[PDB]
Amino acid sequence: MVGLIWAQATSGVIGRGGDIPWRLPEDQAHFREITMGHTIVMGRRTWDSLPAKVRPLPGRRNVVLSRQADFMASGAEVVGSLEEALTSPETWVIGGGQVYALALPYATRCEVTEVDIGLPREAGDALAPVLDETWRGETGEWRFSRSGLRYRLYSYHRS
Ligand SMILES: NC(=O)C1=CN([C@@H]2O[C@H](COP(=O)(O)OP(=O)(O)OC[C@H]3O[C@@H](n4cnc5c(N)ncnc54)[C@H](OP(=O)(O)O)[C@@H]3O)[C@@H](O)[C@H]2O)C=CC1
Ligand SMILES: COc1cc(Cc2cnc(N)nc2N)cc(OC)c1OC
Secondary structure: OEEEEEEEEOOOEEEEOOEOOOOOHHHHHHHHHHHOOOEEEEEHHHHHHOOOOOOOOOOOEEEEEOOOOOOOOOOOEEEOOHHHHOOOOOEEEEEOHHHHHHHHHHOOEEEEEEEEOOOOOOOOOEEOOOOOOOOEEEEOOOEEOOOOOEEEEEEEEOO
């Protein structure tokens, strides 16, 4: 089982300038709840994006995908291919617009957070993968974050 998890603006933007372009404090706990105790896979840039005090993410086996055989990632496992990263029975791909695209075909689950923020795509932004009709989903109820942004959770699956 390979699952993807991300938070996106309605527009599909998930990253800009190397950061997540919004504040949603409730996201951290939902992300934790889903990923805790599992192996997590991320692209090198997502690893770099993680604050130094929080990486590697605690309670999870951190796997970082990189083309540099010499890449240094303390507390994480650096691999050079997707096949080497997906060996666990339950793996969660936590990032990179690139890595989500790469891992989507191996996936049978997607946990998505839609952020109701006006943020049109700009050239160079990290974008979420598009889910075609092979996916079946359930949309949760919109809620208000204390940051003032409205958001909702989606759960998709396919066999
Ligand atoms: N909103 C959300 O939920 C999330 C948003 N993000 C955002 O996403 C952005 C980063 O996304 P993005 O720029 O696409 O980067 P990625 O995180 O996907 O990392 C891309 C890197 O992964 C490695 N890589 C990619 N493909 C391969 C491959 N086929 N084989 C081996 N290594 C590979 C390379 O590392 P190298 O160059 O070292 O070889 C490449 O530069 C940031 O802005 C981040 O904040 C991240 C996570 C969640
Ligand atoms: C928990 O800390 C982070 C987690 C993530 C990945 C991530 C965060 N939220 C969601 N919903 N899906 C994800 N894959 C990405 C981050 O920065 C890009 C983080 O630092 C803020």
